[PDB]
Coordinates of C-alpha atoms in Angstrom, one line a residue:
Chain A
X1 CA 11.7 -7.3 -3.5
X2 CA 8.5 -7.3 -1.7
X3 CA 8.1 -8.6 1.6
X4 CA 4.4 -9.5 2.6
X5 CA 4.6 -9.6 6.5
X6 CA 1.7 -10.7 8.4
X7 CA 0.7 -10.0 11.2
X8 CA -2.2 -9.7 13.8
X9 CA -4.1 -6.5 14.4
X10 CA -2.8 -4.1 17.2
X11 CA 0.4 -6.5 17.8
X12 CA 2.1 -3.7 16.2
X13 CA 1.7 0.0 16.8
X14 CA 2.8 2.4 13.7
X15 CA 6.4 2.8 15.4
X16 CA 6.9 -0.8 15.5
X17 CA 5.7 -1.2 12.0
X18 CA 8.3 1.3 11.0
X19 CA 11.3 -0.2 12.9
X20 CA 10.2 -3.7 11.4
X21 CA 9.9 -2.3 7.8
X22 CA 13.3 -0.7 8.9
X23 CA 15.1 -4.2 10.0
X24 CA 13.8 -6.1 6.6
X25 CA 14.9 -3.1 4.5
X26 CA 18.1 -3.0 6.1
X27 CA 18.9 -6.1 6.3
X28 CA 17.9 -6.8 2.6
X29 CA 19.7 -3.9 1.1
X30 CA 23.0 -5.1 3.5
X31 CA 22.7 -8.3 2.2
X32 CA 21.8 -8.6 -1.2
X33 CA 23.5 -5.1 -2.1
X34 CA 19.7 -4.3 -3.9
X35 CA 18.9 0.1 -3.3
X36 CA 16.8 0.3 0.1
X37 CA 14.2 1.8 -2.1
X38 CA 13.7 -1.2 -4.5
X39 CA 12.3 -3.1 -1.2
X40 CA 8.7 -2.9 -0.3
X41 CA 7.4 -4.0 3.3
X42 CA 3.8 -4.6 2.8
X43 CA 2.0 -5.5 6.3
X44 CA -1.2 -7.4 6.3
X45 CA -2.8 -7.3 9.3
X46 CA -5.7 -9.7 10.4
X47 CA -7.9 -10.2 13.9
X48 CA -6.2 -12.2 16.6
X49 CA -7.5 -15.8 16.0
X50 CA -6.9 -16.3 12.5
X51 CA -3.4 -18.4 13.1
X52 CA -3.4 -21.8 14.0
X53 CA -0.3 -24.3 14.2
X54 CA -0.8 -27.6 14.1
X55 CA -4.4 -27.2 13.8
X56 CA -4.2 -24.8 17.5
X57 CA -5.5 -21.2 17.7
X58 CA -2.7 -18.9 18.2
X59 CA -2.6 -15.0 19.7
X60 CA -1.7 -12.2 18.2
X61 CA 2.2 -12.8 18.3
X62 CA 3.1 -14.8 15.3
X63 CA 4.8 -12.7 12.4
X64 CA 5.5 -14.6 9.1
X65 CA 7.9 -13.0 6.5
X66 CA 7.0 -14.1 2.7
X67 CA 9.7 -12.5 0.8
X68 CA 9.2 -12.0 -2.6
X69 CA 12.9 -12.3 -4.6
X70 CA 14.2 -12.4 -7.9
X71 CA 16.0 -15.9 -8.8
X72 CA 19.7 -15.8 -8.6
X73 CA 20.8 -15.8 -5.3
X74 CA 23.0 -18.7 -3.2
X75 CA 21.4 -20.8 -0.9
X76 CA 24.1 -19.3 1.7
X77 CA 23.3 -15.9 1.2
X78 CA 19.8 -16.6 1.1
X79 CA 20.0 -18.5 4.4
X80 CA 22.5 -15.3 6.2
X81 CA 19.1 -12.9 5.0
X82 CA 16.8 -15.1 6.4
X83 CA 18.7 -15.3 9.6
X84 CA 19.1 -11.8 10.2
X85 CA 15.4 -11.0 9.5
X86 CA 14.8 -13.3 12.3
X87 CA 17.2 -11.5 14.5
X88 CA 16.6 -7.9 13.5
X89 CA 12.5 -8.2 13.3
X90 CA 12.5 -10.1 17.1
X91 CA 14.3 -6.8 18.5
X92 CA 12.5 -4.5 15.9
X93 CA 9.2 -5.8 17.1
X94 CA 9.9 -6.9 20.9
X95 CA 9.0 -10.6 20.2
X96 CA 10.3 -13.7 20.7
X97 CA 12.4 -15.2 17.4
X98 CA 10.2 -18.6 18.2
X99 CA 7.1 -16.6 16.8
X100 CA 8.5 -15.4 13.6
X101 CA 8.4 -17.9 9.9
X102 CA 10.4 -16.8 7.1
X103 CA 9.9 -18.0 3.7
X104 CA 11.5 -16.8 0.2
X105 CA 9.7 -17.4 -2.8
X106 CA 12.2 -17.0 -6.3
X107 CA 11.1 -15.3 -9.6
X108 CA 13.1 -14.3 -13.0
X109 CA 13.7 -10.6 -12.9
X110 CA 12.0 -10.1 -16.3
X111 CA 8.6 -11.1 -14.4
X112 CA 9.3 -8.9 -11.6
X113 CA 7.8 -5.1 -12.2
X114 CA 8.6 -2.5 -9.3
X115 CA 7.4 1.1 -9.6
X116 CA 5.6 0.7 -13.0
X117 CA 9.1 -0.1 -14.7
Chain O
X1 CA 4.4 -25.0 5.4
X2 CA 1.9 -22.0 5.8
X3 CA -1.4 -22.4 4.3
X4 CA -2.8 -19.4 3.2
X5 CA -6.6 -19.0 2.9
X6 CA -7.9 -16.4 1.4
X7 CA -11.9 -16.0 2.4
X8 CA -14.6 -13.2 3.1
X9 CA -15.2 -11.7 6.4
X10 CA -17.9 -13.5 8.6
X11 CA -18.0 -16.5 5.9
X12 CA -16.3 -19.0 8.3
X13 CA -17.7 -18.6 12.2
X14 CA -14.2 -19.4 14.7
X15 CA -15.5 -23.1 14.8
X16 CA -15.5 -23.5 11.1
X17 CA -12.5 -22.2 11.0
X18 CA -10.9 -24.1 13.5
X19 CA -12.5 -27.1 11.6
X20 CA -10.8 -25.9 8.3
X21 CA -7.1 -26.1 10.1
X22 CA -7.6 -29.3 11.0
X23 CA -8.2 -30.2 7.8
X24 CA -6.2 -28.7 5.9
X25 CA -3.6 -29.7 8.6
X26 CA -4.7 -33.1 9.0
X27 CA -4.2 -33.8 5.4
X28 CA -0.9 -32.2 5.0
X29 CA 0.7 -34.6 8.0
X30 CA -1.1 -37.7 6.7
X31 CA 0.1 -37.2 3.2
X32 CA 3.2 -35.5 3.4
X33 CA 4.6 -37.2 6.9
X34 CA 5.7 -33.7 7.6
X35 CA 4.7 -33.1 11.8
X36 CA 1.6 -31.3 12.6
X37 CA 2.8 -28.2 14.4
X38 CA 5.0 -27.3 11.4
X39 CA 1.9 -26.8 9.8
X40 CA 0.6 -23.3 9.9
X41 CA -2.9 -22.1 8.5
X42 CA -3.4 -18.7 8.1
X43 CA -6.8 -17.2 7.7
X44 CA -6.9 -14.2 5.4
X45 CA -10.7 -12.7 5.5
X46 CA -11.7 -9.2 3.5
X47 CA -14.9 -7.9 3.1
X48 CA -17.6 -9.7 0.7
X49 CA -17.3 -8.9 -2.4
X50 CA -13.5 -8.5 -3.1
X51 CA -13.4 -11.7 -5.3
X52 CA -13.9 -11.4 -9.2
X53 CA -13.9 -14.6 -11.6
X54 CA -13.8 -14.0 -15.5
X55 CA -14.3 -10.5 -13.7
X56 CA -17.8 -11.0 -12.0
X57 CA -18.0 -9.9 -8.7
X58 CA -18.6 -13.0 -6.3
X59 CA -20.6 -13.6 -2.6
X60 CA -19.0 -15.0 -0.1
X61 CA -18.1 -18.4 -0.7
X62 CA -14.7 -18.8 -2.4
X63 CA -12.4 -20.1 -0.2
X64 CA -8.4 -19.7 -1.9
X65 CA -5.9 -22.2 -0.2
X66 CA -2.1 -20.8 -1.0
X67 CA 0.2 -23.5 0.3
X68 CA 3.6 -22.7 0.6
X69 CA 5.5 -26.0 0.4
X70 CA 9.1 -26.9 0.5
X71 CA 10.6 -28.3 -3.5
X72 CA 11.1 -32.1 -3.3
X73 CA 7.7 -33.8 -3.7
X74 CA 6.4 -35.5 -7.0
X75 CA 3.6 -34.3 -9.2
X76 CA 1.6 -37.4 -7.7
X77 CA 1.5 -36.8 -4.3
X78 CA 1.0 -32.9 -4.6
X79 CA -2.1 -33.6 -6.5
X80 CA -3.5 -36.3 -4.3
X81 CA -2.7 -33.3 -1.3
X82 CA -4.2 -31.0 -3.2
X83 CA -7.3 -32.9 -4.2
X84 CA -7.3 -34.1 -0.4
X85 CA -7.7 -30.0 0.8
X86 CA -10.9 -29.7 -1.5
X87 CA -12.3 -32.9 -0.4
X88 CA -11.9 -32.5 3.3
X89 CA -12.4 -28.0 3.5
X90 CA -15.3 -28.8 1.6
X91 CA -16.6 -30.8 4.4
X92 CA -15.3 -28.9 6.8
X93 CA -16.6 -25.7 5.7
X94 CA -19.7 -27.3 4.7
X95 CA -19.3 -25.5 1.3
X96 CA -19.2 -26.5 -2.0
X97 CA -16.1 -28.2 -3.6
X98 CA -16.6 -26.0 -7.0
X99 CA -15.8 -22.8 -4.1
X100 CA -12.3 -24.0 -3.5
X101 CA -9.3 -23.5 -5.5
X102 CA -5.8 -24.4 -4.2
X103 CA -2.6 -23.8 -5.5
X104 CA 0.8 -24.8 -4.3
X105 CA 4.2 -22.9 -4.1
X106 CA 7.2 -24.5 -3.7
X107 CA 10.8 -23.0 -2.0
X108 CA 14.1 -24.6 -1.5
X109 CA 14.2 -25.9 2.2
X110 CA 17.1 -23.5 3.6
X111 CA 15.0 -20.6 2.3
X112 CA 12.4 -21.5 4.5
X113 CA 12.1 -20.5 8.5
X114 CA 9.6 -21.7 11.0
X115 CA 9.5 -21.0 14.5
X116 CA 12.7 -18.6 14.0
X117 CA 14.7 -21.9 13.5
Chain U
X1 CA -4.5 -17.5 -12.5
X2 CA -5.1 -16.3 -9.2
X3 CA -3.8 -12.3 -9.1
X4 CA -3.5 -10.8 -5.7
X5 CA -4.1 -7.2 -5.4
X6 CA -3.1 -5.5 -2.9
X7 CA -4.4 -1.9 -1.9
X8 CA -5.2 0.2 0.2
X9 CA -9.0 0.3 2.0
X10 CA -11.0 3.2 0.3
X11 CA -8.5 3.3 -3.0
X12 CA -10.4 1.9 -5.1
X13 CA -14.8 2.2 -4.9
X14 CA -16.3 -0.9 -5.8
X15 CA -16.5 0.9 -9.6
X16 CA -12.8 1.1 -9.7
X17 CA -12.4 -2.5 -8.3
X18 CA -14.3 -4.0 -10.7
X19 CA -12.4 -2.0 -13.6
X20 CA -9.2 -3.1 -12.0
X21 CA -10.4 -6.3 -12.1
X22 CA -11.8 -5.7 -15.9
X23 CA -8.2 -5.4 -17.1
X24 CA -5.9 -7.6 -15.3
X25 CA -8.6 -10.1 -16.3
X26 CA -9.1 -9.7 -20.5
X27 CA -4.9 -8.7 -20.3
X28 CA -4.4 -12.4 -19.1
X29 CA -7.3 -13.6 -21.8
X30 CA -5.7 -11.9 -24.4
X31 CA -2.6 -12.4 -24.0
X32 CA -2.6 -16.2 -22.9
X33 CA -5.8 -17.4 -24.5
X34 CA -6.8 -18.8 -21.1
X35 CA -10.3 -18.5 -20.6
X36 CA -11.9 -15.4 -18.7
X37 CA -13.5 -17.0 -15.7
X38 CA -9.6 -19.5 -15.1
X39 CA -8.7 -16.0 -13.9
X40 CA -9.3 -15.0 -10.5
X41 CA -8.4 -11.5 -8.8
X42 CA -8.7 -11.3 -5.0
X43 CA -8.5 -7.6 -4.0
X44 CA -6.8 -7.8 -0.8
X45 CA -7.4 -4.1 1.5
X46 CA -5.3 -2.8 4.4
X47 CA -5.7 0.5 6.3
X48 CA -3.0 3.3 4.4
X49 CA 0.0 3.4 6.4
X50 CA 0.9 -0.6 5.8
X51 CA 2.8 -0.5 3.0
X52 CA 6.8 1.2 3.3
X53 CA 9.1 1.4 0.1
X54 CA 12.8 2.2 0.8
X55 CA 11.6 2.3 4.7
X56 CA 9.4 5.1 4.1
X57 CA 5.5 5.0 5.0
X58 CA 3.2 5.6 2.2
X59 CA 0.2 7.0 1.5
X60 CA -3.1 5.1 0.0
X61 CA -1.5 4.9 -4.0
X62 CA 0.5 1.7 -3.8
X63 CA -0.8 -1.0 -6.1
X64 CA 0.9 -4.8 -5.2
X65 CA -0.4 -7.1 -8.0
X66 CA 0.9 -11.1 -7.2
X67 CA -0.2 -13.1 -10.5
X68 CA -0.2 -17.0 -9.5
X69 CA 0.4 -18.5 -12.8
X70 CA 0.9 -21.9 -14.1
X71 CA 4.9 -22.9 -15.6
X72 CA 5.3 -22.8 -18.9
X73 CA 5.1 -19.6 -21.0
X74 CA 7.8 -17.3 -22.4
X75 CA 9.6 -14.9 -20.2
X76 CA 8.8 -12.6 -23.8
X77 CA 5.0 -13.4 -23.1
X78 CA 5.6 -12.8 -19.5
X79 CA 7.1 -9.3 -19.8
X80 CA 4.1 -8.1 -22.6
X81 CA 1.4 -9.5 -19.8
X82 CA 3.1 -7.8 -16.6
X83 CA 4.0 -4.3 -18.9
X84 CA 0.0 -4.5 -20.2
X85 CA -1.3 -5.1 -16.3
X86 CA 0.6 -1.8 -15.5
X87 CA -0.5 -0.1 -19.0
X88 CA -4.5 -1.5 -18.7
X89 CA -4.6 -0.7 -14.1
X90 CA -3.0 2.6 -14.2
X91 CA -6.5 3.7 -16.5
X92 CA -9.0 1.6 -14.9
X93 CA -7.7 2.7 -11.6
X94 CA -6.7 6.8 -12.6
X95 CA -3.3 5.9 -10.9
X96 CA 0.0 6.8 -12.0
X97 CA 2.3 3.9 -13.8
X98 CA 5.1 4.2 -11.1
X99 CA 2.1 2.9 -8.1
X100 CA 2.2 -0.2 -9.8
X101 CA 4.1 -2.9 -8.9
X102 CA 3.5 -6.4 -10.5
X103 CA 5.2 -10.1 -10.1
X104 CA 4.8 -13.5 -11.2
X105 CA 4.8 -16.6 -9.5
X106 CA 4.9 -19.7 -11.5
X107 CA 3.5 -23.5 -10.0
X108 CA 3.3 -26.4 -11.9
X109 CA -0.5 -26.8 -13.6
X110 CA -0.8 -30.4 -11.7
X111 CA -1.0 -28.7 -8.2
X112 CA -3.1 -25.6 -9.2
X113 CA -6.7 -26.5 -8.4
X114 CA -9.3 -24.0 -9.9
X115 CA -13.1 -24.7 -9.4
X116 CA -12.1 -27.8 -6.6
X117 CA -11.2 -29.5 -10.3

């Protein structure tokens, strides 16, 4: 899979990048049973300011998770992954669970190219 | 949902876009009934320049709206949301309407997490 | 189509970026028939070090292409179109095959809005 986590600039220093790319991997390879190295954590940063809810400027705290997965998976199982990114990226990062969004989007495998393969 | 918008650095001053969540989250309520703070926009700028159409390199104009929705509306109204985004971001961002694409995504409801809930 | 591409800053000169852009582009003419300037690419830079497979930091070489696609074609077509992005980027971009990593998403054509039309 690849997970496209985004975040605001400085909110997370290279060790906490690490232990969050750590708790998604982890947590995705625990779950799902997919190799830890078939799971890419891409982090796009942007300046503090760029999040709004509900039309209301945010700081530099919210983290949202877009996974990227192939089709195929139970809604239950989907839901348990979902969960425990929640829980595993609030400690991996220090933050509060209320500041982190995770969404899954679903495509077939034969549309889904990792390392050139 | 998290609206995604994809524009180039120093395109939209913090007022703009300020004026482009409210838009963008305005129309999603008012259409969709869906409450306004479940609405996230999320402003993702890079340098002028990045954008290519039938591969020409574009200025700074083009403003890409990703909305990641839950499954479960019809074709009708996600049109009429989607025509409402030009319509009012054009406005908002006092920019041309022919600058704006917008694409929807669409997830099953338990695969989708806001505010760690 | 919309194709994110996500690299890493100073990968790719604007040369490259515009060859990159080259070939993902007349791939999804060729192969589709949809015209040249439908496709959009959106080059999407973060500073090296973002981007983990397996866990593991990397170094500037990743390549993440996204292709936002309407519903509707073959998963045969599919695989030819992803297997040709990896084939026609690795050149334009001097980057070995295994760097690459491409997905599709798929939306229905009646909420994709291209050119605020």
């Amino acid at each position: 899979p690849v997970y496209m986590v985004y975040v605001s600039q400085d909110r997370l220093t290279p060790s906490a990048k690490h232990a969050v790319a750590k708790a998604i991997t982890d947590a995705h390879r625990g779950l799902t049973g997919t190799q830890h190295f078939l799971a890419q954590v891409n982090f796009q940063e942007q300046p503090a300011g760029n999040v709004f809810l509900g039309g209301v400027q945010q700081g530099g705290d919210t983290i949202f998770v877009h996974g990227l997965h192939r089709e195929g998976r139970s809604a239950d199982l989907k839901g348990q992954l979902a969960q425990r990114i929640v829980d595993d990226v609030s400690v991996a990062a220090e933050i509060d669970r209320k500041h982190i969004w995770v969404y899954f989007g679903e495509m077939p495998a034969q549309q889904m190219v990792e390392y050139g393969r």
